């Protein structure tokens, strides 16, 4: 569910702004699906966040 | 597969140092094998360079290699030994056993 | 093959698609660490003792023990202006961005 | 030169004592007495030799 190929750049700029790094065991739950915009679908299975 | 803390025993005997450790004779240290490949998990509490280097690896593997899977966190043990002077200590030694991995 | 040494990295944020939120700057000296650790390690850069030790075993049986890994053991920030996730505009040190040593660990 | 057969136990002996870690010289004695018998053969493993 995580295509590398088209998730690595956009994943990745989220990490380093410290966002899509809270645990859902959920604070930034929300915060990381705004820094993905529309790749939250192809993309969150990257940081699980679904 | 990914990063992880594997076992490592370590028996002082087999390492030739029997003759100025007199105790523990052998501890679990444990060592931190796996690979490193995006996406780096926040559990492996990524530096902003190993993001990044990560990524560009992602993109051209050719041109970048990957971040390393080590020790992030250790704790120390002591340990009943004789120094080169010839007195017994019993000392904590720092920085012994592996507690988390992450790629770096 | 060389010994963990610090070696070039060039960032080029747009080729990594970052300039669509990277106003400046466009490209930066991140740098790298690779090589090999095998015993000795270089003492006077102060490895932890666990690197000490499996070295030592790896030596004794690389058949049986992994070596460690050449990583940086130190890094430096740099400042990037960019827009966030709202559409602020944010200057900011980011951490942890350029290395400055490395070491085995 | 450094013979790692010979010097890899006890160098790292010494080196998780927290001995021979300096650089020409403080340290260098004790570094000394603690390699021992083995000092012309293993110093250069450690950068001691002077
Ligand atoms: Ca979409
Ligand atoms: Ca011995
Ligand atoms: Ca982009
Ligand atoms: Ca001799």
Avoid at chain 2, 2 to 28: Q, T
Wanted: with cysteine; charged share 20%.
């Amino acid at each position: 569910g995580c295509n590398k190929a088209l998730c690595a750049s956009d994943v990745s700029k989220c990490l380093i702004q410290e966002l899509c790094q809270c645990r859902p065991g959920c604070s930034c739950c929300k915060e990381c699906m705004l820094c993905l915009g529309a790749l939250w679908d192809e993309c969150c299975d990257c940081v699980g966040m679904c | 597969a990914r990063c992880s803390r594997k076992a490592l025993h370590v028996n002082f005997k087999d390492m030739g140092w029997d003759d100025w450790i007199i105790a523990p004779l052998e501890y679990e240290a444990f060592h931190c094998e796996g690979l490193c490949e995006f996406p780096l998990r926040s559990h492996l509490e990524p530096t902003n360079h190993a993001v990044i280097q990560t990524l560009m690896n992602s993109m051209d593997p050719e041109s970048t290699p990957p971040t390393c899977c080590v020790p992030t966190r250790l704790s120390p043990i002591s340990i009943l030994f004789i120094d080169s002077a010839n007195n017994v200590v019993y000392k904590q030694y720092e920085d012994m056993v592996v507690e988390s991995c992450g790629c770096r």
